[PDB]
């Protein structure tokens, strides 16, 4: 495990300001602009428990780990060609460890 861990306090702050518009975390949470992110560290992204992805997501079959998730959050419009996630990207490495630490606990 080479991925640095951070504080979930500022990770919670980053998710509610840069992710909450499109994602929820809670068990049974509704889908918004983006799909529900409960149990994202269990299997692959696309399909989900419902929701209609595009033709680029479901075909790559990446099991979200703690660094490829970190890679995707840096420049999403790069790792996969044809994603609907319009995100500017977390550039600051200290922003990317806090959020994943908060995300690996809120998603159980």
């Amino acid at each position: 495990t080479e991925f640095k861990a951070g504080s979930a306090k500022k990770g919670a702050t980053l998710f509610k300001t840069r992710c909450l518009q499109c994602h929820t975390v809670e068990k049974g949470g509704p889908h918004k602009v983006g799909p529900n992110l409960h149990g994202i560290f269990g299997r692959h992204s696309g399909q989900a428990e419902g929701y209609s992805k595009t033709d680029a997501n479901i075909k790559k079959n990446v099991l979200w780990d703690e660094n490829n998730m970190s890679e995707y959050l840096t420049n999403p419009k790069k790792y996969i060609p044809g994603t609907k996630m319009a995100f500017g990207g977390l550039k600051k490495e200290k922003d990317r460890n806090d959020l994943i630490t908060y995300l690996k606990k809120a998603s159980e």
């Binding site: 300001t17 518009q21 602009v33 420049n75 419009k77 319009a86 995100f87 500017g88 600051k92 922003d95």
Partner: protein, 294 residues
């Protein structure tokens, strides 16, 4: 006795490379000043700044516009319509210290182009040569449009900027960026979810959200969705007017066409009132930071 002509004069011995450095400096600061306005960044406020310095233009007597950089003076800086833009001015203020040769109008307009491109919008060709004019050339307050209006007001206002229906609806797509702030404009809330990435979601939200006319805490009325988005009355008029509605559907369905139309209309907006000489350089298209390896 004379006609009102604003002739563009390139900064002494400056070329594409000089202005790319300024672009790069603005774009780097946009990248690193990430916390502003609850992590929206300075992208949207710079776009609004570029439109507010340009939106004072009047085609009937060729007053206003981006040419003079008159937003730096007291009268324009204090226009109630420009409330909140002081943050964009403070943003570019150190960049002007870094590049003291660039004019105020060029810097204000380049900041809007940089913001659009760095928020993954279309490439926007940009021309230099705006010249700082004296304080007596500052347009009086009242030239920028009001949000509590209908489609007929929107149509007739942008006629003053020589903009037609297609350019109006395209330019309004910039409201996918940022948010209204109650303390600035009497309206509170964003227009969409991805408010620092340039997309066509303004048109998708207009068409697909369930909108309800509601009061806000400033006693003003706005359209609100259950998703927590809002639309100004002037925004909502684009789907009340049948000619505007036709264009809104076109852009909601084809982001590429919207990007092409916005690029033309936005460059046209930043250049209203400027007469470029015959020996004037071709418009610059700047590289993004990503295209430069960052």
């Amino acid at each position: 006795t004379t006609p009102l002509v604003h002739v563009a004069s390139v900064e002494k011995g400056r070329s594409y490379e000089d202005f790319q450095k300024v672009y790069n400096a603005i774009a780097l600061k946009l990248r690193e000043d990430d916390e502003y306005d609850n992590y929206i960044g300075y992208g949207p406020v710079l776009v609004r700044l570029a439109w507010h310095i340009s939106g004072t233009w009047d085609k009937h007597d060729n007053t206003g516009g981006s040419y003079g950089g008159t937003y730096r003076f007291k009268k324009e800086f204090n226009d109630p319509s420009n409330a909140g833009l002081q943050n964009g001015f403070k943003f570019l203020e150190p960049i002007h210290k870094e590049f003291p040769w660039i004019s105020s109008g060029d810097l204000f307009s380049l900041g809007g182009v940089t913001a659009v491109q760095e928020m993954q919008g279309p490439k926007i060709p940009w021309r230099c040569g705006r010249v700082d004019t004296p304080e007596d050339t500052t347009p009086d307050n009242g030239r920028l449009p009001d949000a509590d209006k209908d489609a007929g007001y929107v149509r007739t206002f942008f006629q003053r900027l020589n903009m037609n229906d297609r350019e109006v609806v395209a330019l309004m797509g910039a409201h996918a960026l940022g948010k209204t702030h109650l303390k600035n404009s009497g309206y509170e809330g964003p227009w969409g979810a991805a408010n620092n990435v340039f997309t066509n979601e303004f048109y998708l939200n207009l068409l697909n959200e369930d909108w309800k006319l509601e009061k806000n805490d400033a006693n003003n009325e706005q359209w609100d969705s259950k998703s927590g988005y809002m639309m100004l009355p002037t925004d909502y008029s684009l789907i009340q007017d049948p000619k505007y509605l036709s264009i809104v559907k076109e852009y909601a369905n084809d982001q590429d066409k919207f990007f092409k139309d916005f690029s033309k209309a936005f460059e046209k907006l930043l250049e209203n009132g400027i007469t470029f000489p015959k020996d004037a350089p071709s418009p610059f298209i700047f590289k993004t930071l990503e295209e430069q390896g960052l």
